[PDB]
Design a protein around this ligand. Structure first.
Ligand SMILES: CC(C)NCCCn1c(Sc2cc3c(cc2Br)OCO3)nc2c(N)ncnc21
Length: 206
């Protein structure tokens, strides 16, 4: 039983714009999601200052990137604060689009507070799987269209705490499934992240 919701008008506009743009430096999406992951980790860590038990659901603070080639999927996981069903369901958007019209580089998206949407530069569908200490695990899904769904999660691996951004990459952006490519993008735009960034690589035994 999934629930469907309509996106705020400006958001639907932003997604269409991003998923269709021919912008050339699409790799910036990884910088933005890692940044958001880092932000969520900061949150749970700061919250744990006066409520240590909050960390018990998942003691390790990390950002993990897992390419799943067979499915043409790239996952960006963090053991941050997570999001409840209400948070997933419920700006900076309009001002950013106006900046874009004037010539601003798409890479400024994060400074406008909407960097999450840069994922549509390399993917045409996304599932945000999240588990907040305050709610059950839920799945938020969008295909850049005007509506998104939120479903109680009974199909994905249990997240102790945190969020998984599961990107369904576009057929021409499959390079982001490659370990070599992924590393260089990370090393290039995320040198000062306080959390370990783990890359999960699958290698056939010799
Ligand atoms: C204070 C509040 C306005 N910040 C919201 C940040 C939402 N968010 C984001 S950005 C985001 C996430 C969404 C979303 C919109 C955004 Br923007 O709808 C689908 O889930 N990434 C997060 C993450 N990795 N962990 C926890 N929260 C995350």
């Amino acid at each position: 039983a999934s629930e469907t919701f309509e996106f705020q008008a400006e958001i639907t506009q932003l997604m269409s714009l991003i998923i269709n743009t021919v912008y050339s430096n699409k790799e910036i999406f990884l910088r933005e999601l890692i940044s958001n992951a880092s932000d969520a980790l900061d949150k749970i860590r700061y919250k744990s200052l006066s409520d240590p038990k909050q960390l018990e659901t998942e003691p390790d603070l990390f950002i993990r990137i897992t390419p799943k080639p067979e499915q043409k999927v790239l996952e960006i996981r963090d053991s941050g604060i997570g999001m409840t069903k209400a948070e997933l369901i419920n700006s900076g958007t309009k001002a950013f689009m106006e900046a874009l019209s004037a010539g601003a580089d798409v890479s400024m998206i994060g400074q406008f507070g909407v960097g999450f949407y840069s994922l549509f530069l390399v993917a045409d569908r996304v599932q945000v799987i999240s588990k907040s200490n305050d709610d059950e695990q839920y799945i938020w899904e969008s295909n850049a269209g005007g509506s998104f769904t939120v479903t109680l999660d009974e199909v994905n691996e249990r997240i102790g705490r945190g969020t998984i951004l599961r990107l369904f990459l576009k057929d021409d952006q499959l390079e982001y499934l490659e370990e070599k490519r992924i590393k260089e993008v990370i090393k290039r735009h995320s040198e000062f992240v306080a959390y370990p960034i783990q890359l999960v690589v699958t290698k056939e035994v010799e």
